[PDB]
């Protein structure tokens, strides 16, 4: 599972922008929202498309799910539980690097 997680993390760091929103609370929301939809899409579940925010998380997650399936043959071989575990690991890594340990001094500024 470590090499697979390393693959996902390297993908998100070089490609995605949603983890780099302006404030901590937005990064947290996006890491959770997008990666939950990625898990759905990678395991054949119906995505959530109710609210405008769910629809946006689906749009971000569809790019990543499609990219992950193209780039990484393992992503079509592992089972649903393994996908879920990886994405939970990926959430925790992204929080770590984009929030906990980021020295970006603006992240907690109450006003935009």
């Amino acid at each position: 599972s470590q090499s697979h997680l390393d693959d996902l993390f390297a993908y998100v760091e070089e490609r995605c922008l949603w983890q780099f929103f302006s404030r901590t609370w937005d990064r947290e929301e996006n890491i959770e929202g997008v990666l939950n939809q990625v898990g759905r899409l990678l395991t054949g579940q119906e995505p959530l498309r109710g609210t405008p925010q769910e629809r946006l998380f689906y749009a971000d997650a569809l790019a990543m799910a499609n990219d992950v399936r193209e780039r990484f043959p393992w992503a079509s071989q592992v089972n649903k539980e393994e996908i879920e575990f990886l994405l939970d690991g990926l959430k925790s890594r992204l929080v770590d690097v984009t929030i906990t340990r980021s020295t970006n001094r603006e992240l907690n500024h109450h006003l935009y």
Binding site: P52, T103, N104, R105, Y112
Partner: protein, 473 residues
């Protein structure tokens, strides 16, 4: 590691602003300090907060008087310097307005001078009914209350609408403060003060694109094809009143997250409009962007038809340039965002290796992005200065530098060609066709007989004058 350049031995705080990315490093321990005070006397590239409000954002609008409350220099200095065309004959670039502050106004106040100037502006151009008023260094220092003047003028002239910005040049540390003050004032005062007809089931604002050489008009051809109504462009080829309608959109698409992320964030907070960040430079990036937009709207098939046609049209040319540009080394010395929009896109789509990057005013968030996307062995510089630029050139030996024209004219003496990273050479540079335009200018810049000629010293009997072979896509 963090780098102490030789030229910075006497200003060694600059080490905390310069990152050389090395293998195995945890980049979280090497994020440059950004958006901090400038060191005096350095020949930093930075501008002023007024610039970020008036020149960058407000002045893009096609139908608005840009009233600069201050002495005439601030106005002269922001006139004939930008390349943001309109569809109405470029009114924005033809005119600039000043209150012509004199010593007596410093002494006694400038509010009546401002009020007079505002009525004169509206009298001289009776078809124009919109205005932005900016403060500058001295009008801020003397405390003229431009919001109260504006209120009086709107009471006296009920057919006009006036917005005000407090952005003297000494506020903040750079252009960035101007972006912030304008964005938050606009959302606080003017959004949801008008509505427009909705003509589509799919509506968006495009936030953070300033129509450089027609970028916004080019992207607009995509949205028209897709059947998406753009309520407001913030601010490329835009109008004052469109901006008052931003709350109507279903989706905010953001390119310049630096200048314009503020208003996207507030629109989300206040109105629930989701923020989607894209890259509207870069060929494969543009495709991802379109696919995200279309997935949000549920028009995925329409997006795939547009993408297919654009790749059939432009991809062969792009690939012809990749073949010739692959392995070339580039530097990007611009404001900030274009660093992270371009580093990987030129690598993916053109095979170009970005070896050094410098941001005049970017924040730590911009450095997070660019370091995430950027290469090992590359220099990442916050608030670079002229001497640093020379030392970096000696370290990395770029084949081409994307930067402003004055620095381009400087590095020309070193026989290094430039592309104008700000106002472009032959743009637009956004979108599918735009990235081919960018590639063409990079190719012509590098594969240029004059560079080779300049190296030859005709006095050297051992040297001949070469002949070089170019191509075209």
């Amino acid at each position: 590691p963090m780098v102490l350049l030789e030229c910075d031995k006497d200003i060694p705080e600059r080490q905390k602003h310069i990152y050389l990315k090395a293998p195995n490093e945890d980049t979280r321990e090497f994020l440059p300090i950004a958006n901090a005070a400038t060191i005096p006397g350095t020949l930093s590239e930075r501008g002023c907060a007024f610039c970020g409000a008036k020149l960058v954002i407000g002045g893009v609008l096609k139908d608005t008087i840009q009233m600069i409350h201050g002495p005439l220099g601030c106005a002269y200095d922001t006139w004939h310097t930008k390349r943001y065309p309109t569809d109405n004959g470029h009114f924005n670039m033809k005119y600039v307005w000043s209150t012509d502050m004199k010593e007596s106004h410093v002494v006694f106040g400038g509010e009546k001078r401002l009020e007079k100037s505002m009525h004169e502006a509206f009298d001289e151009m009776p078809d124009i009914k919109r205005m932005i008023v900016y403060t500058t260094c001295p009008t801020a220092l003397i405390g003229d209350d431009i919001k109260a003047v504006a209120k009086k003028v709107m009471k006296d002239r009920p057919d006009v609408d006036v917005f005000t910005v407090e952005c003297p040049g000494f506020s903040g540390v750079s252009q960035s403060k101007g972006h912030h003050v304008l964005n938050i004032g606009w959302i606080n005062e003017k959004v949801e003060t008008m509505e427009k007809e909705i003509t589509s089931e799919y509506t968006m604002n495009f936030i953070g694109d300033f129509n450089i050489q027609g970028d916004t008009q080019l992207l607009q051809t995509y949205w028209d094809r897709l059947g998406i109504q753009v309520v407001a462009h913030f601010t490329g080829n835009g109008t004052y009143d469109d901006l008052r309608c931003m709350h109507q959109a279903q989706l905010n698409v953001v390119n310049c997250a630096r200048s314009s992320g503020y208003i996207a964030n507030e629109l989300k907070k206040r109105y629930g409009i989701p923020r989607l960040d894209i890259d509207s430079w870069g060929f494969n990036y543009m495709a991802e962007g379109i696919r995200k937009i279309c997935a949000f709207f549920g028009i995925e098939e329409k997006g795939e038809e547009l993408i297919a046609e654009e790749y059939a049209k432009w991809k062969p040319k792009l690939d012809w340039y990749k073949e010739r540009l692959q392995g070339k080394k580039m530097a990007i010395w611009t404001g900030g965002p274009r660093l992270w929009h371009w580093t990987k896109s030129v690598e993916d789509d053109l095979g170009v290796q970005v070896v050094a990057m410098s941001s005049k005013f970017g924040h730590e968030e911009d450095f997070e992005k660019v370091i995430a996307r950027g290469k090992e062995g590359t220099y990442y510089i916050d608030d670079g200065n002229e001497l640093e630029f020379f030392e970096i050139i000696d370290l990395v030996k770029p084949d081409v530098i994307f930067t402003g024209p004055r620095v381009g004219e400087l590095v020309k003496k070193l026989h290094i060609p430039y592309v104008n990273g700000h106002g472009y050479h032959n743009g637009p540079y956004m979108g599918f066709e735009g990235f081919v335009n960018l590639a063409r200018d990079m190719y012509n810049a590098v594969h240029n007989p004059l560079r080779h000629l300049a190296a030859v010293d005709i006095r050297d009997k051992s040297q001949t004058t070469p002949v070089i072979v170019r191509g075209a896509a």
